[PDB]
Design a protein around this nucleic acid. Structure first.
Ligand SMILES: [Ca+2]
Ligand SMILES: [Ca+2]
Ligand SMILES: [Ca+2]
Ligand SMILES: [Ca+2]
Ligand SMILES: [Ca+2]
Ligand SMILES: [Ca+2]
Ligand SMILES: [Ca+2]
Ligand SMILES: [Mg+2]
Length: 307
DNA sequence: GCCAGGCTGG
DNA sequence: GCCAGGCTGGTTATG
C-alpha cells in the first residue's frame, strides 16, 4: 500500500473545483479499513487537517454518510451508530436491535470499550436510559457480549430441555414467560441454539419465528425476531435486511449503508451468495435499481461484484 | 396451547 | 377412512 499517494490524490480531488467525488469513492471504497486508517493518518500529516472533517465539507447527501462511516474503525462505527440510535427523546429501536443482535462477543467487547472512550459513558447505561421493560432486559443482556462460546461437545440433553422450556414459556401457556426466553436466547452458544430451535419444532406446532410473532409485540417482538435470524443464519439475516431496505418505495438508506459498510470486510461474499440464491437476482442488481450517482457507485464497490 | 369447522395434498 | 400439511372462528390453556 501507498497511503501517502492515496492521501495526496484525495486532497487533489477535494480541492478541485466542484470536488472530484469519483476519485474519493474509487479510492476509499476499494481499500481495507486498516488501509483507510493509514490514509487518514497520512492525510492529516500532509494537510494539518483531519480527513474526516475535510470530507464532511467536500461531500453531502448519502454519499457523505457512506464515506464518513467507512473512515471509522469497525468498533468506532458501531459505537457511533449505537449513539445515533439513542439520540434525542426518541429511540431508533430498529438500528439498536440490528447492531446488538448481530454482533459477536468479541465485537461487543470492543464496542463497549470504544463507546466509553468516545462518549465517556458506558453503553449499558445509555441503553438503560433509552429503553424499558423486557425490551431493556433483552438489549442489556445481549450487549454484555458474554454469550457462551461454542463448546467442543454438543449437549443434546440441554438442547431438548431448552426446547421444552421455550415451548412451556410461550405457545403452550397463556401469556409469556419472557425472562425464560431472554435467559436461554442470550446465554446459550450459537450452535447450541441452532439445534434448540430445530428441536423446538418437535414440541411446538409453530417454529420459533412464528411463535415469537404469536406471543409478543412491538420492540420486544422485533428484537427476538432479529436475534433468532441472526442465530440461525447471519449472512441470510443481512441479505433479508438488505432486500427489505430496497424492495419497496424508496430506500431505507440508513440500513443499506450501515450493512454494506459494516459487512463489506466480514461476510459479504456469504451475504451475496444467500441473497442471489433466495432472490434470484444479485445484491448488485438491487443496489443498481434503488440508488444512483456516486452514492450508487460507492455501494457497488462495497458489494464487490455482480452475483 | 384449547375446542371446533372446511380445505389441499398422498 | 388413514397419513401428512395448511387456514378459519369460538366455547378457549396452571385456565
Ligand atoms: Ca463534483
Ligand atoms: Ca457536507
Ligand atoms: Ca433517546
Ligand atoms: Ca422509536
Ligand atoms: Ca402464550
Ligand atoms: Ca405479535
Ligand atoms: Ca426501493
Ligand atoms: Mg473490495
Amino acid at each position: 500500500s501507498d497511503a501517502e499517494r492515496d492521501a495526496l490524490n484525495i486532497e487533489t480531488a477535494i480541492k478541485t473545483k466542484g470536488v472530484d467525488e469519483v476519485t474519493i469513492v474509487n479510492i476509499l471504497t476499494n481499500r481495507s479499513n486498516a488501509q483507510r486508517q493509514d490514509i487518514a493518518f497520512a492525510y492529516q500529516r500532509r494537510t494539518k487537517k483531519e480527513l474526516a472533517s475535510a470530507l464532511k465539507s467536500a461531500l453531502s447527501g448519502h454519499l457523505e454518510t457512506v464515506i464518513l462511516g467507512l473512515l471509522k474503525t469497525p468498533a468506532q462505527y458501531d459505537a457511533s451508530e449505537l449513539k445515533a440510535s439513542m439520540k434525542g427523546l426518541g429511540t431508533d429501536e430498529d438500528s439498536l436491535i440490528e447492531i446488538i443482535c448481530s454482533r459477536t462477543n468479541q465485537e461487543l467487547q470492543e464496542i463497549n470499550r470504544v463507546y466509553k472512550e468516545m462518549y465517556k459513558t458506558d453503553l449499558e447505561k445509555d441503553i438503560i436510559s433509552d429503553t424499558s421493560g423486557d425490551f431493556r432486559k433483552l438489549m442489556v443482556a445481549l450487549a454484555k457480549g458474554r454469550r457462551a462460546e461454542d463448546g467442543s461437545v454438543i449437549d443434546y440433553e440441554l438442547i431438548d430441555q431448552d426446547a421444552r422450556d421455550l415451548y412451556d414459556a410461550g405457545v403452550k401457556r397463556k401469556g409469556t414467560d419472557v425472562p425464560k426466553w431472554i435467559s436461554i436466547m442470550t446465554e446459550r452458544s450459537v450452535p447450541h441454539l441452532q439445534k434448540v430451535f430445530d428441536r423446538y419444532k418437535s414440541y411446538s406446532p409453530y417454529d420459533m419465528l412464528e411463535s415469537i410473532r404469536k406471543e409478543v409485540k412491538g420492540d420486544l417482538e422485533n428484537a427476538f425476531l432479529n436475534l433468532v435470524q441472526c442465530i440461525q443464519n447471519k449472512p441470510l439475516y443481512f441479505a433479508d435486511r438488505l432486500y427489505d431496505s430496497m424492495k419497496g418505495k424508496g430506500t431505507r438508506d440508513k440500513v443499506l449503508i450501515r450493512i454494506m459498510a459494516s459487512r463489506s470486510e466480514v461476510d459479504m461474499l456469504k451475504i451475496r451468495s444467500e441473497f442471489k440464491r433466495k432472490y434470484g437476482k444479485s445484491l448488485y442488481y438491487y443496489i443498481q435499481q434503488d440508488t444512483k450517482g456516486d452514492y450508487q457507485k460507492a455501494l457497488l464497490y462495497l458489494c464487490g461484484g455482480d452475483d
